[PDB]
Amino acid sequence: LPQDRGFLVVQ
Amino acid sequence: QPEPIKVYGQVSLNDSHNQMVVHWAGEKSNVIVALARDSLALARPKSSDVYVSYDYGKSFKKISDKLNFGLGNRSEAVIAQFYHSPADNKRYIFADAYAQYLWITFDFCNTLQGFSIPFRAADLLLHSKASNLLLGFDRSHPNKQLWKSDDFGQTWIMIQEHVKSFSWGIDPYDKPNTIYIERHEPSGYSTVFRSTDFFQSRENQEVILEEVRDFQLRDKYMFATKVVHLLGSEQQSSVQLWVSFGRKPMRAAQFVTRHPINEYYIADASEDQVFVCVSHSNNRTNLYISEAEGLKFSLSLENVLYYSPGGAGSDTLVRYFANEPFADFHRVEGLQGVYIATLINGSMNEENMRSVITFDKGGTWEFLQAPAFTGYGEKINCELSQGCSLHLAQRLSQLLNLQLRRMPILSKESAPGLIIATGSVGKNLASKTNVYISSSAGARWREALPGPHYYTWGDHGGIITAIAQGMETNELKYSTNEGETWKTFIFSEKPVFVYGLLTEPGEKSTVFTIFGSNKENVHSWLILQVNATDALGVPCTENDYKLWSPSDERGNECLLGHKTVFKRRTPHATCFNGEDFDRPVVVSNCSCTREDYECDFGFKMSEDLSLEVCVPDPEFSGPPVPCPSTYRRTRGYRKISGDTCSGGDVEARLEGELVPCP
Ligand SMILES: *[C@@H]1O[C@H](CO)[C@@H](O)[C@H](O)[C@H]1NC(C)=O
Ligand SMILES: *[C@@H]1O[C@H](CO)[C@@H](O)[C@H](O)[C@H]1NC(C)=O
Ligand SMILES: *[C@@H]1O[C@H](CO)[C@@H](O)[C@H](O)[C@H]1NC(C)=O
């Protein structure tokens, strides 16, 4: 599962 | 079986930007806003797309094209960040990464209007009560200028130069329009100002503290670090922590210390009390706790796991992910005295970390009592007295092992008492990781699920969801009984890579949002929406509720002579509290105990530890003016700061003695 793609942040 | 979970929406974005920023507008708005942007880490971001939904994630509408330079600019817009209003959830502002240009909306993004502005919006800060009001900072400017807008970002005026940092004040402690700033000085350090008129008049500008390293604002408290040259230039500088409570002038706090203090970190500030991490120049960090409403810090726990770019952990992986110091220290949210910390024994790796917990705001600490039985049911052999306990991973522990997707301890005021954490049973944090759950605010745990998972809860804690980490999947594990049992739901036909599993902040819904990308192709964003009402099935009734306070776990002991009781649904009840559940909470004072009192100024504990009273201290030999009203003179015993104790015999006698005015 790729280490530097698909990162999520809530605001 | 009519499936107990519906897939209320499936959405492929056709977007492959590495990062997504999501905002629910809430207030039953039904609007969700997303920005797909390239990784922040690089300062060379190359493209962005913006999407908004109006049917609560059933379907997203791409609006990147509506962000343009008006009619007609072929230059292509690129968004760094977007900012929402705490005051008005309809309003939004998007900022171009390159162009000194902004976009605004008061209609949930239906209509966007472009404006150029006199600076680049590196950072904006929107007033939290006055929707129209906000500030904007241009870091990359040589003068580091600060601007205010009065009309939600159309027109600006530049109100200060050489700003290091800044913030609005806080209601109600500060006046309206109060702005704090650190301004740079020719010494390394900076001066702290407060202004009520946007730095227009000199008589409305106020110096808070001079020559500071950092400054921070937190409810009643303000903190700063000062480097003082006591011996002189030739001698050792002393690093000090300055503190204001209730906006009284800042004074330097007193620390009882073997060693030179190297830096301070404010770990938590609540109920008129402060947790500070004092780290020394030997890379050890201990944890102090403020007296209530006070500057009197005493040692609480030693060797807390801590990172600072200046200090400890600086020379490990963490530095590539954190540019600001922090600690593996957790406040169990919605509760007063409960915290979880990671201790460090040797050098920084799993083997040396153990978790400890407190229920008395750091008065005492224990290790975490491991669950008796595995998820499956078999006995777990673990004895506190053999140095075996439960240990929970936190961002730092995790960041060292480069595990960027793991879950920090989860706790929220939606579900007082409920903690879910990634962790391990053993001598330390270095074994297989599982998912552990407590609803006793940490007092007792269960092994909920074996592997690493993403987890979240909804319906005020009544339903929990989870997705196994590391490989592709289409299983959604869920539990309605605090993780005692689980059931799987297949959320899509072919398994997919999951990037996260969320609920609208507040955790009130039975809706969950899965983000991910499908397996076949390389990364492209994809969002599923999922309704789990039918897993709870029916509304709760008075029968499904029961009363609970943390006191109930630490043998009825109050905290600062008061305690909080919560109405919580029992663990076995299958029923739903409802989005509008308005959870009964009652705070009350409890009749007095010995632990509510301390020895008065110049009194002490007699040598006989066995039996403990206060006795006039010999070395102090030992009065209200003017008295006309009654004096109530000491018996040597004093209610401890902030303690709202009341009633009971121990109050009756142990309290101070009256003498009618001189
Ligand atoms: C219009 O296009 C130019 C590039 O030709 C760009 O620099 C500019 O930012 C756009 N509009 C404004 C107001 O800057
Ligand atoms: C503490 O950590 C730093 C890295 O920030 C390292 O260079 C140094 O050797 C350590 N200092 C001591 C006194 O152990
Ligand atoms: C720290 O280390 C010693 C041995 O190196 C060990 O016996 C002890 O259990 C550890 N102490 C704590 C508080 O973890």
Ligand SMILES: *[C@@H]1O[C@H](CO)[C@@H](O)[C@H](O)[C@H]1NC(C)=O
């Ligand atoms: C979830 O499903 C139930 C019907 O089973 C419905 O009452 C509820 O409003 C749904 N919520 C949403 C946000 O679709």
Ligand SMILES: *[C@@H]1O[C@H](CO)[C@@H](O)[C@H](O)[C@H]1NC(C)=O
């Ligand atoms: C407890 O005492 C405090 C201060 O002594 C008081 O303000 C508060 O009202 C009391 N608690 C309750 C539930 O009345």
